[PDB]
């Protein structure tokens, strides 16, 4: 199936997974600019040394952040698209090899379908899927109310990544589509502001609810 040249691939430059360069990737949003790490790096696997320190996740390559985000089950204690998705034993939790392969194949599909650098498309997707205003809850007379507040950039990035991962997880659940194809489809849809993307619709709903309660 897979050619031997791909099974035994030897890199010679410091670039993401030995296949893509992030030299020409630019971040349009001024707020997310210092929180999307794009430094040159070959292997995106830091062995979880960043979670100890405050704001430590800022200097972690974005591809590894995506890999960590999809390394989960997906629907444990809340419903996504109206269903619990409890993978359990068959879940991808604690298997970083499989998540790495899924991300690699998704990037290949994205590059084939659009002809652009996959990291650029990922950056566009997270830029379009990050909300700008949220709400917090108050209690009065046994009734719950909302009050509009602003979001810090790091939380924006976290929410965007989680929503992309959840949409990809929901698309491949008990259907004929595979995980890599679902991830590529979700990223491409989110990059074009298409309402069929789970993340973009979620962002629109969040901002609408926040606006209607100023």
């Amino acid at each position: 199936a897979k050619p031997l040249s791909e099974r035994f691939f030897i890199p010679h430059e410091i670039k993401v997974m030995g296949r893509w360069s992030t030299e020409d990737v630019e971040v349009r949003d001024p707020s997310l600019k210092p929180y999307i790490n794009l430094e040159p790096r070959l292997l995106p696997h830091t062995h979880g040394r960043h979670a100890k320190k405050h704001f430590g996740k800022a200097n972690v390559h974005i591809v590894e952040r995506l890999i960590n985000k999809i390394m989960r089950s997906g629907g444990s204690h809340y419903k996504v698209a109206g269903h619990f998705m409890r993978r359990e034993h068959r879940s991808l939790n604690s298997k970083k090899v499989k998540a790495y392969e899924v991300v690699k194949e998704a990037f290949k599909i994205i590059e084939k379908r659009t002809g652009k650098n996959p990291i650029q498309v990922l950056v566009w997707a997270i830029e379009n899927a990050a909300p700008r205003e949220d709400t917090t809850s108050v209690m009065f007379g046994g009734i719950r109310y909302h009050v509009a507040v602003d979001i810090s950039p790091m939380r924006r990035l976290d929410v965007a990544l989680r929503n992309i991962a959840l949409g990809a997880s929901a698309k491949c659940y008990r259907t004929k589509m595979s995980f890599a194809e679902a991830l590529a489809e979700e990223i491409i849809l989110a990059a074009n502001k298409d309402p069929k993307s789970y993340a973009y619709s979620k962002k629109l709903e969040i901002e609408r609810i926040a606006e209607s309660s100023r």
């Binding site: 949003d29 001024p30 707020s31 405050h54 704001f55 700008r132 205003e133 949220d134 917090t136 809850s137 108050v138 209690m139 507040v149 602003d150 979001i151 810090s152 950039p153 790091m154 939380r155 924006r156 606006e211 100023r214």
Partner: protein, 65 residues
């Protein structure tokens, strides 16, 4: 339609029902009222030097102790 960037210059304190909200002072970087300093409520971790994207620049948070 795209909001206005603002820069955080001071941290005041935590607030909210469960201590989830922080009150900060920001300076507008762009738009009609560029250069003005107003206070705002923020959800999520934040530090001096961050940049927020406000959707409107006329609402000011009530001062907390």
């Amino acid at each position: 339609d795209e909001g206005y960037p603002a820069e955080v210059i001071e941290i005041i304190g935590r607030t909210g029902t469960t201590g989830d909200v922080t009150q900060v002072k920001v300076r507008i970087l762009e738009g009609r009222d560029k250069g003005r300093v107003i206070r705002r409520n923020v959800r999520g971790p934040v530090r001096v030097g961050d940049i927020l994207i406000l959707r409107e620049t006329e609402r000011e948070a009530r001062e907390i102790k």
